[PDB]
Ligand binder design. Sequence first.
Ligand SMILES: [Fe+3]
Lengths: 675, 537
Amino acid sequence: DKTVRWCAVSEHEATKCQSFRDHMKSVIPSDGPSVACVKKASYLDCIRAIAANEADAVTLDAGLVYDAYLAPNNLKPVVAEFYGSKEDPQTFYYAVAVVKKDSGFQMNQLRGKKSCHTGLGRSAGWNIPIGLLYCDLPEPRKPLEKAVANFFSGSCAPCADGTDFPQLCQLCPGCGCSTLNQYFGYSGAFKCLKDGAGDVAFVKHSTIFENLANKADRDQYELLCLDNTRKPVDEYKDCHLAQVPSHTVVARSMGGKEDLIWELLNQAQEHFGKDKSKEFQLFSSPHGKDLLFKDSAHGFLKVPPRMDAKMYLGYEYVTAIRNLREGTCPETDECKPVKWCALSHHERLKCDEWSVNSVGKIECVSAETTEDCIAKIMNGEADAMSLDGGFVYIAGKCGLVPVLAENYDKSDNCEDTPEAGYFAVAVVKKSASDLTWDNLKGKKSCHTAVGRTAGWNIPMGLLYNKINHCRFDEFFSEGCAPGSKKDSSLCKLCMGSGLNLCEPNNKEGYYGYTGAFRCLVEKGDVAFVKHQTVPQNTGGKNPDPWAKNLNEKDYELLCLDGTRKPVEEYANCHLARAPNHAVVTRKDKEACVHKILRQQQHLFGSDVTDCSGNFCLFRSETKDLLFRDDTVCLAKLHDRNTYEKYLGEEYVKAVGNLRKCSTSSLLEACTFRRP
Amino acid sequence: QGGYGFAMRLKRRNWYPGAEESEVKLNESDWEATGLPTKPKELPKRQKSVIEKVETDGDSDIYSSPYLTPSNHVNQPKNQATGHENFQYVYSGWFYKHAASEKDFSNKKIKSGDDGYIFYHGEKPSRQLPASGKVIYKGVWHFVTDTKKGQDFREIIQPSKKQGDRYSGFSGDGSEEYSNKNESTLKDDHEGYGFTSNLEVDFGNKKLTGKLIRNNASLNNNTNNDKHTTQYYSLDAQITGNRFNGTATATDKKENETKLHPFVSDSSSLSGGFFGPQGEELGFRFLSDDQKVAVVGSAKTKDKLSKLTTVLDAVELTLNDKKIKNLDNFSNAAQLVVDGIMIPLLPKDEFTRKFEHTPETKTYEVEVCCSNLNYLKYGMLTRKNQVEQSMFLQGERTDEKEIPTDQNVVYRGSWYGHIANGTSWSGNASDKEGGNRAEFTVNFADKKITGKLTAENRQAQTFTIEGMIQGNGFEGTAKTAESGFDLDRTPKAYITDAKVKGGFYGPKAEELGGWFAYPGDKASSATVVFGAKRQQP
Ligand SMILES: [Fe+3]
């Protein structure tokens, strides 16, 4: 009996839910998803009920989504209400801080200015901006209204207590809580900025587009960005205080029935959604306003599995709300420890050594996969890591920015010398001949890991263009592509032990460039790797028993034109050019990371002669720990600070051409917040 | 010097920059007793309890040998010797977790890397063994190395974690890549999966030899190698009782070649024992002499689908309920094993000796005879924290081959006894004068043994024993004469036909001992243990 127990917060809701239940029954087959209405006293009660497995779903505003996520409720966003249109649905709105043109102050310059808020306890109007400013407020920070009244020189804070904190009503005396106050609400605040009452208005992105009579004249205003610059009003996606989801249905994280819920809601919108039926409207009711869903809902979208409450609300929102709930401020004032994210134990061990040697300027966090780590960087849990260009692509879509680049070219100009990137090559045994780029079908393949430039993106994208279909495990007989689904044929050649098999970290010995080459040696027909890999691993350069006796002349590269050439010929035989691996971070950590890493590499960088008695940041044993082992230095990006600018137009098109084949969960989640 | 099992903990070297420890070696001090397992397939409690409390960064799991009962974590790693996979009594193996770095910066210390143990333990150390014959034991082995700055063993563990440098190399390491543990089929000359042991135990000559090997992997390039196994050691040991002692010899040395693996030194510390009813399983350890390597292993006779000989006697006789229990013993008459702990029967630093032993619940109070008996000890054992009462006897039997044929041989000694009908008499082992006294004549040719136990006022106070001998031991009866003991006109105590069991102890039957409880049958009651030494003519 597959039944979604929906939680109602009022009798009016309860009766709407029952109408919902009865109408679904007339549409869904008996055997399928049905509604059960369970009534509770309040949203908290509902959240607890869902956690207690006494009920299944409820729809929350943003703040409650956060509450729902905390222990011991541990609930997650599953379905999203969207607004305004099917082709361009608004799941989210953006809280922005809007100011006048050329008024010359940034977000960290706000102390002393005059503020306009939509009203107290509103999200964009109050909670977000005050939350992000919380540490800038003078102590005591309790009670909040008093602190805020001391931060700004004067305000309009509708609904604020003006009796106790006069300056909060200064721009709208009385602090009126209704539209009777010309400064109340969204338009109210904007009109307060326009009137020249305040210096800044805290509103959402749609506010100025809606409230300007002339509609050009937006060029008279800008937005404050968290990095302390200003962008034009149209740039709000890139300049905003927080991105918040409007109305979100949540369920248990484990055993939450997310499938059932999405099946139910999807069928419901089909029959009862906007304009769909005269018999029942999911999105209105006679009984009241906004029952079970907002009346302005146009439909539902499924929230991607990878998402969790922190990731869905976003870094900035969570920062603001945590500041408000917890209330902990740091006591100072220069660069804090950079938290580096390590891949499993291998990377964690070296990262610890790095931290001890940097005397605390570096700290360590582990995750079992690159995607996991990237998400921690999004969180705040971690600060930075270095990434294969395929992952600087994903991190980019996830909002992270590139800061320094790995340089593999040897010179005394290194940090100041941009590189064009290395080469993705297809490597085969000289002994096996007549196997060509023209048909590799049915042969056995070795990849660095799924989603990586040479090992995956370049060769598979090309193959995709040839074969025009996504299943490469059907194309190759077998292979090792770490990060593949474990029951795939692309996990079969992997050397990983037990559950380690095909894991995309160093627990799998076929993981990474060297890992892949060892796979070609020991199992496969063709390995996808960087052009440097065969010379690095032959001629005794690699001491380990497997590669100890390997000779370079025993391998050849597959040329696109259907021919083969010796591995030195890689300039004229290659699959494509790969952008150098780069370090990525959050925009807010980007200055600190750039400065700390430059110091750190001057200390531990390839200038370090003896790598035994001392720590060498750029070396490990064949494993590329924390950085490629061939990294000469970390180089200045300059204008190239966005993933798109950094990778180049050509690579970003190639990876995008592969979008239909993507197994990436994190990419799915990210492109959902920001297409 | 025997025990139920032993473990050795991985070492983590201190790398703190400028305070760096150059090396951490292994010692004989580093063996920890596992104590008696409740379930052999489970991890040893004490050490598991240690690893549980160890901090980790996000991997909290304890990984262990694949055949161990996990807590907690077709396919997947195997370690076994083909055809001897099924262990009842003994297990060896490893368990670890990936521990967080331990930092005390006040003392300039960081240790990094995995943390765990290699160990073996078994239950029911054998009191019987095959009386002759050669027998194949196969099994597994495991190792843990020292740590030295710059050290790596590339042929066994791939040093991406600095195994052998920052923390011990060990056979459990995830980075150990060259065994066949992960494959789905065996080559013909493979002995099994992973590191396997092979021993030949000759019970006739009391000698054991064997080889410890790795089974190597086979795929594609490297199938040129022709050798599917590699032998790191050979073993030799002298068996005495249920225990054996010997040496290990490092097999792979081309030296002057410097080595890509840890097994270099030989070992004079090889030690182990037989477990199970016939001694069909065994476990062992050794520590290389350069202290670079420590090994534990187990082996067993071929899985299913000669006459035996009795190696030792160990008995507890409970004074209250008049019951005889077998005690475990390690073929050391001077090591009293009760309730899974070992009481030393000899001092550290006279005839009959009393002490208290508080292990580190209970406190044991022990009176033990005699100072002239090397292969046998007997006496009173009492338990407290209210008080439980027992007597004990244990001896190491003489080899069935070494038994005397002399037709008249006199043994003299003492006894402890407690005897009652309606009232209690109790008296203790004394080396004179009107004290407890034991007299034996043994005709070995005739296979007959007679004796008399005389008490304080003697006799008067007396016991008569007649028995038949088989092999290294004897059975018989004991009687109170007539009528009654006197239990001190006086009350008496009537015992006719008490069952007596005993053995001959030490080389050439230098000693004998025995005991009986009563009744066992359908009156009076008694419990007695006695022991005696072989007199000159
Ligand atoms: Fe790469």
